Structure formats: C-alpha cells, structure tokens
Amino acid sequence: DFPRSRLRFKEKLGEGQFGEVHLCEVDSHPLLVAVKILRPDATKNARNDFLKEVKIMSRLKDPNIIRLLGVCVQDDPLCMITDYMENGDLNQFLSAHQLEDKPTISYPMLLHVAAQIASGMRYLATLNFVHRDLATRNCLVGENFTIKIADFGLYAGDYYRVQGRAVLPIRWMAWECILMGKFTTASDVWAFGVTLWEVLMLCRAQPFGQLTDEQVIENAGEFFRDQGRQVYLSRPPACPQGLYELMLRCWSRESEQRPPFSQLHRFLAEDALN
Ligand SMILES: Cc1nc(Nc2ncc(C(=O)Nc3c(C)cccc3Cl)s2)cc(N2CCN(CCO)CC2)n1
Numbered sequence: 001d002f003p004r005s006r007l008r009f010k011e012k013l014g015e016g017q018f019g020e021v022h023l024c025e026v027d028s029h030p031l032l033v034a035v036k037i038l039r040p041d042a043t044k045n046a047r048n049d050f051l052k053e054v055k056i057m058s059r060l061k062d063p064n065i066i067r068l069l070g071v072c073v074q075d076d077p078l079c080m081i082t083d084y085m086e087n088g089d090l091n092q093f094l095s096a097h098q099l100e101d102k103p104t105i106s107y108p109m110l111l112h113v114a115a116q117i118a119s120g121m122r123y124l125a126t127l128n129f130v131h132r133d134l135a136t137r138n139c140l141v142g143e144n145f146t147i148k149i150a151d152f153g154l155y156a157g158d159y160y161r162v163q164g165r166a167v168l169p170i171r172w173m174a175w176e177c178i179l180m181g182k183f184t185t186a187s188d189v190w191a192f193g194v195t196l197w198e199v200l201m202l203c204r205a206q207p208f209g210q211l212t213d214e215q216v217i218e219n220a221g222e223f224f225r226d227q228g229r230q231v232y233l234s235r236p237p238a239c240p241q242g243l244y245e246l247m248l249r250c251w252s253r254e255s256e257q258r259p260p261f262s263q264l265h266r267f268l269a270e271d272a273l274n
Pocket of ligand 1: 013021034035036080081083084086087088089140152
C-alpha cells in the first residue's frame with residue numbers, strides 16, 4: 001500500500017493550504033483516481049498537516065463521505081488517493097443546472113442530493129465527528145448524482161479573514177460559532193440548513209449575499225439577544241413552505257432544538273415527497 005509507480009498524472013484539479021489534487025490513471029482498462037500530494041512550496045508544517053489529514057480520513061468509511069483508497073506515506077513522495085468524483089464540487093455542478101420547467105435537475109433530485117448529504121452527516125454524528133465547514137463547495141459529485149462530503153480546501157468570498165485568526169465561513173455558521181468559536185454536531189446542523197438552502201437555490205446566490213460580513217456577524221449578536229431582530233435566509237423559489245420550515249428548525253436559537261441528522265434524513269427521503 002500503495003506502489004507509487006502505478007500512478008499516471010493527467011490534470012491538476014485544485015490546490016489548498018498544504019496540498020494539490022491531481023486526476024491520475026492506475027494501470028493495475030482506464031481506472032481514474034484523485035491524488036493529493038504536497039504543494040511544491042511545502043514546508044515541514046505542511047507535511048505534518050498532510051499526515052494528520054491521512055489519519056483523520058482513514059477513519060471515515062461511508063457511501064456519502066469521501067473515502068481514502070490508499071496512501072504513499074512510507075517511502076516519499078507523500079500521497080493520498082480517493083475516488084475520482086467526475087462532476088467536481090456540488091456548487092459548480094448545481095450552478096450549471098436549472099430547475100426543470102413543469103442541463104436540468106428535478107425537485108425530487110434536489111431532495112435526493114440533500115438526503116445524501118444528510119446521510120453522510122448522520123454517519124459523522126455517530127462518530128461524534130464535527131465537520132466545521134459543511135457547504136456545497138465542500139461536497140463532491142460522482143456518477144448518477146452520487147454525493148460525497150469532503151473536508152476540502154477559490155471560494156475566497158465565503159470566508160471571513162482577520163489577521164492572526166482562523167479563516168471562518170461565517171455565512172454557514174450558527175450564531176454561537178460566530179460569537180464563541182464553539183463548533184458541535186448542533187452547529188453542523190445549522191450549516192446543513194444553509195447547505196440545503198444553497199441546493200434549493202441551485203447555488204445561484206451567496207447566503208446573506210446582499211449583507212456585508214460585519215452585518216452577518218452583528219446578525220449573530222441578534223440571535224444571542226433574542227429580541228426579534230435576527231434575520232434568516234429567505235425561502236428559495238424552488239422550496240415549498242414545508243421544506244422551508246425544516247430549514248428554519250436547523251436555525252433554532254437553542255442548539256438542542258435543532259433536528260438530528262437522522263430526522264433531517266427521514267424528512268428529505270420520505271416526508272418531502274408528499
Ligand atoms: C476540483 C475538482 N475535483 C474533481 N474531483 C475530485 N474527486 C476527488 C477529489 C479530491 O479532492 N479528493 C481528495 C483527496 C485526493 C485527498 C483528500 C481529500 C480529498 Cl476530497 S476532487 C473533479 C473536478 N472537475 C470535474 C469536471 N468539471 C467539469 C466542469 O465543467 C471540472 C472540475 N474538479
């Protein structure tokens with residue numbers, strides 16, 4: 001596990017903080033995989049983060065979570081190998097589709113997309129694993145509208161950057177994450193609510209897109225104060241009222257009032273059809 005010389009590099013797919021992903025072919029006719037390797041400018045800190053991500057990823061084994069197929073971590077150079085998800089991230093994919101009138105996507109397909117994210121998150125919750133950056137940009141799309149959640153690191157405007165602070169996806173963040181940096185399964189539910197809003201919007205608009213970062217942060221202060229001045233994402237045109245109410249439960253002020261992923265999954269697979 002795994003002979004590096006079996007890998008044939010084809011195209012660079014993307015790039016993050018301590019790694020670079022490439023499309024590769026495996027001889028082992030044409031098997032495609034995604035391969036993450038260190039960036040050319042990698043430091044010893046990047047090598048350490050890459051080894052950790054290997055450890056984190058090795059534990060995740062579910063149909064709707066990206067799966068580690070293999071590793072080069074013994075003799076150099078370091079590599080991580082996953083399924084190649086041929087349709088890219090879900091944000092770009094939904095951006096290229098329009099909702100069916102009466103490349104298109106049906107409303108029941110939007111539900112099926114959301115249900116797969118909810119099942120993936122259901123699995124993470126059983127492991128008490130907190131994702132901290134659930135969004136359509138961190139979901140990958142395979143064949144037959146198969147969704148795998150990644151942890152994935154472009155979408156610069158989706159993160160609030162202050163020097164010397166962690167980079168924060170504030171528009172997906174529960175009011176208590178913004179005010180206190182506390183991330184829990186309950187805050188992943190709130191982000192799931194925002195992710196479901198993105199799916200039903202077909203990624204046509206940034207969440208709170210007409211509000212500044214500072215207004216989004218002061219809106220978290222309004223959830224805290226609980227004086228009826230907090231503001232929510234509006235109902236997407238493709239979204240019925242019943243499904244909108246489910247998004248609103250994800251954005252309950254009280255963390256314990258937010259539905260668990262098992263309930264969100266049931267609703268989107270079953271109740272949402274009626
Ligand atoms: C950014 C991107 N990724 C794609 N597929 C991937 N599969 C798996 C990926 C991945 O990163 N694995 C991974 C690894 C290896 C280690 C740790 C963690 C992880 Cl999650 S990335 C396809 C794609 N394209 C598809 C075709 N589009 C046509 C548009 O018109 C263009 C864009 N673009």
